[PDB]
Design a protein around this ligand. Structure first.
Ligand SMILES: Nc1nc2c(ncn2[C@@H]2O[C@H](COP(=O)(O)OP(=O)(O)OP(=O)(O)O)[C@@H](O)[C@H]2O)c(=O)[nH]1
Ligand SMILES: [Mg+2]
Lengths: 148, 863
């Protein structure tokens, strides 16, 4: 057997490393599920103050007639003036919601529909989206100091 | 006969038409889709696969509505559970540009994870043009930075698709003006790495996309759909070129600076972005009655009645797919941005040797990769000459022997030993393989009969004439971008079933090209991969498929490199004397980059001995070598040089010439297996001081003694110095939200020898991008630490394509090193611990005593 005289010990293999890399980290049992590796770091801004706006949380972006066309030429949707309808913010928040609340059989989103949804996952802080944004920072910044 | 072909989905176009394209070599384009992890390339091929096929069996679930992607190219069970491309897949499709000319274009979908870099290296070796898919949010990160450089490094054309545009509108909720600024900064960074070539939307170089919502477009495509029929046919070309940059439009005019009293919106945001932003906004937020009219009035888009019932996200992917239609702007960018004349001749020279085109009768092909489909082994092969007929017995030569066979070919200018029969020829379809009778020049296909005469890659050809056989060239073995540094040793649980493990290990050596698997002469078998994911994936394949046995493996380990940190003493039948000193720091890097010198005054390492005049010039001018040493260089090997520092009136240079080849061969054996723990030597400058020339013997036996003695001679030179142990260093690319940087730093301190280097703010996003390096031995579970510590708001990947070797802390000859038996060794003992433990696996501390006679060893101890 590979004795203690052969093995190089440098870091302890935490229990979470076995649910992440089963076959590599000596999980052994054949009947262990190989899991979803990860998902791209999501940055969904539900800025909460009306048009779209640059959120102050975001880093800045570095920077900032010889030929003519008909005078009536216009972009594709210049006829419609407003980029943002009154219920766009709610529809976008509803778009990022989970399986139950994100679906409508084609009907228009209403400010009441998101209000009940927002109250719902606020009352269940175990899943969904209440941990996201500032809540996660408060939880994660403290929970690391408490563990170590 | 149809056989099992009855199940493959039919293509809207007749496949026989597509096959007819291959008759004209100028009508085939080999495109490989590459990019960082989870950028969109697997979901991008979905579009093309869907647009090319009439109906997909076993579908009709949430994929039809777009709730979950149809991972058509990621079919392996491990690929489905993990959610990422693992092995290179592809699809041969007939595509048409905006000028109605059609091509057969061979797509290869490469994995984005850093661990599978060996796969994209196969794609780069196969592709003529590469589609680099990048996530808008992360932008031009290190992984795409090295992909740009690596594409330019090879000879592949490039067009950029900048994916996940939905993130800006919905996730970041950026306004169109600020959104365009982000898109411009991304393109800005692209050009900083593309050297002379300028990439821009108006040059059909850059494609926009949101593969999740089913659309990829280009400015040319956009104007062709909804603006071309509103302006004079002559003005269309001038109009597109004004849709990017500081160009503003008002009531029919174009001026560089903004109009004083109108909204100061450039053309791109006014004619493209704000249309996009408000077909996003209106689809999610506007009444279906008013919306259906706008789509009909502005886009000539009719909304079916069932569509008005769709859930929002399926509705969004539906309307967008109605507008942007079959990615044709993408295929235009590919066909326009190629120009084969310059590249193909250059690409073939780099993948092999420079020379004259092969005779049109002789068959010549690049078998790139071994992959198993339906259990049986296949071979990804791209044809360069001749015509591949089914059943044509063909001669296969493993790319390892290519170096030996090419010089032996030139020797024969001053019968082939391996051959076999090709049984089947197939095209890639992602989820299927389409059987084909013949492969034409420029096709990349699947081959079945040839996978038993090579391990990792080979060179296919047919003899044809006797005199054409003096002309052909052999493909150089591929340059997998990263070196294998993750070391795992394993043994079967029951020793009787070890042959079953041996046969399965051979299959992984074929299936995983990045892996390096060897058995040490002492006993157990080692697996060399690049990262945790690479190892965990091959083990499952080894455990749950190819062997199906209980296996026992070790903790994560590494391959070390041993070198010196001082010049050493001279020191010394016959005997020879060499001294070793550390190589120049700048020179070590350059050789790690396979180039010697800098500033357009450099020589590629492959022909470094072949060009003696420039070698001497560059060595003296660029590195500062004195006159005599520059000419006297003999060999280069894995970051080490063997120079000739003997005096001409001690051994005649005539006598030294005949023995010089054996002296090199001994220098080679020493660098392969160093003294302390038999690890490869790195970054050492071996000066050959003097040798003995005893006469009165036969040269053939004398030549046999110099090699082993020169091997042993090099060992004392490194041991007489200050011999050190060098360990590889993983580099780490962390993308993490900005206020979450503290947990990154603390986790970084807990890992030894791990520090943060450059820290770049990602523009327009809250997340920061931090580049760092971590020792490979201390890298175990670091990615999994960071993800859970950050709840997913942090993420990192570890690569080793730069070849960083640091000194393992502490002295390594120090016998009195406290090494705990149950807890990790203290810092000052790491060198001694690592070398002794590595030695125990190899067998049998390390000292100079064994190599020097006891009397001479005593005389040196007193002096
Ligand atoms: N917002 C958005 N998300 C996308 C888009 N395309 C893909 N995704 C998401 O990102 C994940 C990546 O999908 P893939 O196409 O398999 O990415 P990939 O580059 O092939 O993955 P690797 O090859 O392992 O790097 C998917 O599961 C989607 O959920 C896109 O266009 N927009
Ligand atoms: Mg994938």
């Amino acid at each position: 057997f590979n004795s203690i005289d052969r093995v190089i010990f440098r870091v302890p293999i935490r229990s979470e490393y076995k649910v992440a890399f089963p076959h590599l980290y000596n999980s052994r049992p054949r009947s262990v599920r190989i899991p979803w590796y990860n998902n791209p770091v999501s940055c969904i801004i539900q800025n909460d103050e009306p048009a779209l706006f640059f959120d102050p949380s975001l880093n800045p972006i570095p920077h900032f007639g010889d030929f003519t066309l008909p005078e009536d030429f216009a972009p594709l949707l210049a006829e419609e003036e407003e980029l943002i309808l009154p219920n766009t913010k709610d529809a976008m928040s509803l778009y990022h919601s989970p399986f139950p609340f994100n679906r409508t059989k084609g009907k228009m989103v209403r400010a009441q529909d998101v209000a009940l949804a927002k109250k719902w996952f606020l009352q269940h802080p175990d899943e969904e989206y209440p941990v996201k944004v500032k809540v996660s920072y408060q939880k994660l910044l403290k929970n690391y100091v408490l563990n170590e | 006969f149809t056989q099992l072909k009855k199940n493959i989905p039919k293509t809207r176009y007749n496949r026989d038409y597509m096959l007819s394209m291959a008759n004209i070599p100028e009508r085939i384009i080999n495109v490989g889709v590459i990019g960082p992890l989870h950028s969109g390339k697997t979901s991008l091929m979905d579009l093309l696969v869907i647009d090319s096929h009439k109906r997909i069996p076993d579908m009709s679930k949430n994929v039809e509505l777009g709730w979950k992607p149809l991972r058509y190219l990621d079919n392996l069970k491990q690929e489905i559970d993990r959610g990422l491309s693992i092995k290179l897949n592809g699809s041969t499709l007939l595509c048409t540009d905006l000028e109605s000319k059609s091509r057969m274009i061979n797509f290869l979908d490469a994995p984005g994870h850093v661990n599978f870099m060996d796969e994209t290296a196969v794609a780069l070796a196969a592709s003529d043009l590469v589609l680099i898919v990048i996530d808008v949010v992360e932008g031009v990160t290190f992984v795409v930075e090295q992909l740009i450089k690596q594409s330019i490094k090879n000879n592949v054309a490039m067009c950029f698709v900048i994916n996940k545009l939905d993130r800006l509108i919905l996730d970041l909720k950026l306004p169109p003006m600020d959104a365009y600024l982000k898109l411009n900064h991304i393109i800005a960074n692209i050009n900083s790495f593309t050297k002379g070539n300028v990439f821009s939307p108006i040059d059909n170089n850059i494609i926009f996309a949101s593969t999740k919502l089913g659309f990829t477009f280009t400015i040319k495509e956009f104007v062709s759909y909804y603006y071309a029929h509103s302006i004079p046919s002559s003005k269309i070309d001038d109009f597109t070129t004004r849709l990017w940059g500081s160009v503003y439009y008002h009531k029919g005019n174009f001026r560089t600076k903004p109009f004083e009293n109108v909204e100061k919106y450039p053309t791109f945001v006014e004619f493209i972005l704000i249309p996009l932003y408000k077909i996003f906004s209106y689809a999610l937020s506007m009444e279906k009655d008013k919306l259906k009219n706008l789509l009909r009035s502005n886009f000539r888009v009719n909304l079916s009645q069932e569509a008005l019932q769709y859930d929002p996200q399926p509705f969004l992917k539906h309307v967008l797919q109605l507008i942007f239609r079959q990615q044709t702007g993408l295929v235009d960018a590919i066909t326009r941005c190629y120009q084969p004349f310059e590249l193909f001749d250059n690409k073939t020279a780099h993948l092999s040797i420079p020379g004259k085109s092969t005779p049109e009768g002789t068959l010549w092909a690049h078998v790139l990769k071994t992959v198993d489909y339906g259990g049986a082994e296949w071979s990804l092969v791209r044809i360069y000459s001749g015509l591949l007929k089914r059943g044509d017995t063909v001669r296969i030569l493993d790319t390892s022997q290519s170096e030996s066979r090419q010089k032996r070919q030139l020797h024969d200018i001053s019968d082939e030993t391996p051959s076999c029969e090709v049984e089947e020829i197939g095209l890639l379809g992602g989820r299927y393989v389409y059987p084909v009778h013949e492969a034409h020049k420029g096709q990349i296909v699947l081959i079945k009969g040839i996978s038993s005469a090579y391990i990792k890659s080979a060179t296919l050809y047919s003899v044809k004439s006797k005199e054409d056989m003096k002309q052909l060239k052999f493909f150089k073995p591929l340059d997998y971008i990263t070196e294998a540094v993750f070391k795992i040793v394993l043994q079967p649980l029951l020793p009787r079933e070890l042959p079953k493990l041996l046969d399965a290990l051979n299959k992984i050596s074929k299936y995983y090209p990045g892996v390096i698997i060897k058995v040490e002469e002492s006993g157990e078998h080692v697996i060399l991969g690049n990262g945790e994911l690479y190892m965990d994936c091959l083990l499952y394949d080894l455990r749950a498929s190819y062997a199906k046995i209980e296996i026992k493996i070790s903790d994560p380990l590494t391959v070390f490199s041993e070198s010196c940190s001082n010049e050493s003493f001279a020191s010394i039948g016959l005997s020879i004397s060499v001294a070793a000193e550390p190589m120049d720091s700048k020179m070590i890097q350059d050789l790690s980059r396979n180039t010697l010198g800098k500033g357009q005054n450099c020589l590629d390492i492959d022909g470094i001995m072949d060009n003696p005049r420039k070698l001497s010039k560059i060595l003296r001018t660029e590195y500062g070598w004195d006159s005599l040493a520059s000419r006297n260089v003999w060999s280069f090997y894995n970051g080490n040089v063997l120079i000739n520092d003997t005096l001409p009136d001690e051994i005649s240079p005539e006598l030294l010439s005949k023995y010089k080849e054996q002296i090199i061969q001994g220098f080679y054996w020493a660098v392969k297996e160093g003294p302390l723990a038999e690890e490869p030597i790195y970054g050492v400058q071996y000066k050959l001081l003097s040798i003995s020339v005893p006469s009165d013997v036969n040269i053939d036996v004398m030549k046999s003694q110099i090699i082993p003695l020169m091997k042993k001679a090099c060992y004392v030179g490194l041991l007489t110095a200050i011999p050190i142990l060098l360990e590889p260093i993983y580099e780490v690319d962390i993308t993490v939200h900005a206020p979450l940087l503290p947990i990154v730093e603390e986790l970084m301190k807990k890992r030894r020898g791990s520090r943060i280097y450059k820290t770049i703010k990602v523009a327009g996003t809250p997340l920061l991008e931090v580049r760092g390096q971590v020792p490979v031995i201390e890298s175990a579970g670091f990615e999994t630490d960071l993800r859970l510590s950050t709840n997913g708001l942090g993420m990192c990947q570890l690569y080793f394509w730069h070849k960083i070797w640091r000194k393992v802390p502490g002295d390594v000859l120090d016998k009195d090193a406290f090494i705990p038996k149950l807890k990790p060794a203290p810092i000052n003992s790491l060198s001694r611990d690592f070398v002794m433990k590595t030695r125990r696996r190899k067998g049998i501390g390390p000292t100079l005593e064994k190599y020097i006679s006891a009397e001479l060893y005593a005389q040196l101890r007193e002096n």
